[PDB]
Amino acid sequence: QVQLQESGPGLVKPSETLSLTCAVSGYSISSGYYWGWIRQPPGKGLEWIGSIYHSGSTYYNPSLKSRVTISVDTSKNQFSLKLSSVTAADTAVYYCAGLTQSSHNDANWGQGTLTTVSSASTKGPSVFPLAPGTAALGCLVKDYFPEPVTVSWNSGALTSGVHTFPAVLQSSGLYSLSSVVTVPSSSLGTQTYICNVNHKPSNTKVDKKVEP
């Protein structure tokens, strides 16, 4: 299947340049009718940034055009976005997208990558257990920045009854998030429960076992 994948999420400081890439699999980047970028500020809708066509011609959102460069690297089968002189107004999830053939009418999208523009610094999380005929248990993923973290259970084997909450921004300027699962009480003595935490901006991954 055609897959687009943005580079990883993170933090950029005010006035510096945001640099993202999108790796295309299952399609030769030179064949695409156009490749482009759309962002979504937190809690808001979609905002087009720009596109590059098969010919190499580019069109950019006129409010961003002075700051935007989109280019294609055929050797990497990748395209890129550079956004110069960023400010907190550029905090958003950035999606890459493209349309494989002009005849075709459904562009392929990437997964989105959250870029936070801040003078704060990257901090990885501490993970604590939320220790447990239903029992609830969970993980508290505390004191990290910027967003996001992802949490799975039992390496993705446990999905039923999982709830991973939106993070809250604490007064310290760091996020905290909880993920919980409800399970049979009788499983507590025999089934191992592990929360798998990834904070890609700090390259922090932790598998925390939660025991009764």
């Binding site: 979609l46 087009w48 006129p62 999606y95 990437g110 998030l177």
Partner: protein
């Protein structure tokens, strides 16, 4: 970011139909095709409708679109719990650049469901570091409105907690809510009784879950 106007939210029960409108101008929707996208929480927009009323492969005929004048509408029939999502319209503007609406959240109606309440003391590992987070979980309730009051040695806590709420559950249309009370270790060791009291339309009186530090 948005240039097209959509209602913030729509709601109906399973099996029913809803419509979501998108209002624009002569120079955008008036002159151009309209597309519609579904955004399941945490995922990219997925195309439902293009060229005003055409479905891409894989989109069922429960979704439909139309355009009249400077407005366009998405219809969803036979609603299912999996349809809970934000929906966006998109078109092109007078420069032939893509533009989008602000999103409409679809909420599925269901019967009242009381939450199941759980309280979690701080872990010994967190305490060893100097902090205590006490967490109260309200699991699988509906409707979304709920109230959590924290009490420490019967003192009502005001301002010392934060909470968040999941999006509606893709299978049972319920919400869940986590609230965290945070104290320093020294303060946490000054008090015995930690209590989370929950009010919700599903509960004929408030439900309290508590523990005594160290017991």
């Amino acid at each position: 970011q948005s240039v097209l106007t959509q209602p913030p939210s729509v709601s109906a029960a399973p099996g029913q139909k809803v419509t979501i409108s998108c209002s624009g101008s002569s120079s955008n929707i008036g002159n151009n095709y309209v597309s519609w996208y579904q955004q399941l929480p945490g995922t990219a927009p997925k195309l439902l409708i293009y060229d005003n009323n055409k479905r891409p492969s894989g989109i069922p005929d429960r979704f439909s679109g139309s355009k009249s004048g400077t407005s366009a509408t998405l219809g969803i029939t036979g609603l299912q719990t999996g349809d809970e999502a934000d929906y966006y319209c998109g078109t092109w503007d007078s420069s032939l650049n893509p533009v989008f609406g602000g999103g409409t959240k679809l909420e599925i109606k269901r019967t009242v469901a009381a939450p199941s309440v759980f309280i979690f003391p701080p872990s010994d590992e967190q305490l060893k570091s100097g902090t205590a987070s006490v967490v109260c979980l309200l699991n699988n309730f509906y409707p979304r409105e709920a109230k959590v009051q924290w009490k420490v040695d019967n003192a009502l806590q005001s301002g010392n907690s934060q909470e968040s709420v999941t999006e509606q559950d893709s299978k049972d249309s319920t919400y869940s809510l986590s609230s965290t009370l945070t104290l320093s270790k020294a303060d946490y060791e000054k008090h015995k009784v930690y209590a989370c009291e929950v009010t919700h339309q599903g509960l004929s009186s408030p439900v309290t879950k508590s523990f005594n530090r160290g017991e």
